[PDB]
Design a binder for these strands. Structure first.
Length: 226
DNA sequence: GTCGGA
């Protein structure tokens, strides 16, 4: 849950969530073009304020002033809503990070083989996020985290954790400022997309290097050639 | 106040 692709146009993602009347996001036809989004970079993050959807470049990571380790990048759904650290973000800082799919590395001895994981039905993914409002300040230490859940079904062959992916409908409800943390916990349970909805394949080891951002990084490869 | 790898 530490790398993903966000490569298509804003409309390609937003059209599944809300029409223009609900948005406060300028039209922009350029593909985002990032096939290898990494922690510590700013990522276009979707949230609701002033009864409209906003898209802000937000630091992927969370390190308050009292935190001494590298920034956290994930928050476990099992505990985030009641965590002393994450409860306020669960209440007030919910957001959505849309993506084409995400990457996980499978341990194969002393080597690690990357896989790209995506929806079999060809929709983008809407990953549940929590973070530090106001997002538009562009903070470089207190940004957002991707909420995670336990891997299910065949994904356990790759890694024991996965992002919490919500249906489009659930993603829209998750962002609403009017709903409580308890209601958000219900949405996170009812809207989670199960592992049987995902497909995956090995990809090139080149995704390990964040200099690489091109479309080839999500193409299937033979492991024997790596 | 906790959770990826070139």
């Amino acid at each position: 849950c530490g790398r993903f692709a966000q490569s298509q146009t804003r409309e390609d993602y937003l059209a599944l969530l809300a029409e223009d009347i609900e948005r406060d996001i300028p039209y922009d036809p350029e593909p985002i073009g990032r096939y290898n989004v990494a922690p510590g970079t700013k990522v276009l993050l979707l949230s609701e304020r002033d009864e409209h959807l906003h898209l802000d470049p937000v630091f992927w990571g969370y390190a308050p002033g009292w935190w001494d380790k590298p920034p956290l990048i994930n928050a476990r759904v099992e505990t985030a809503a009641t965590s002393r650290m994450f409860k306020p973000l669960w209440q007030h800082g919910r957001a959505i990070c849309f993506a084409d799919g995400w990457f996980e590395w499978k341990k194969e001895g002393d080597k690690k083989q990357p896989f790209f994981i995506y929806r079999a039905d060809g929709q983008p993914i809407f990953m549940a996020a929590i973070g530090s409002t106001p997002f538009e300040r562009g903070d470089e230490a207190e940004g957002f985290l991707i909420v995670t859940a336990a891997a299910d079904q065949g994904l356990v062959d790759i890694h024991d954790r996965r992002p919490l992916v919500l249906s489009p409908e659930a993603a829209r409800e998750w962002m609403r400022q009017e709903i409580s943390g308890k209601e958000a916990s219900e949405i996170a349970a009812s809207g989670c997309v199960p592992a049987n909805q995902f497909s995956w394949h090995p990809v090139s080891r080149a995704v390990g290097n964040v200099k690489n951002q091109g479309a080839e990084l999500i193409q299937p490869v033979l492991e024997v050639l790596f």
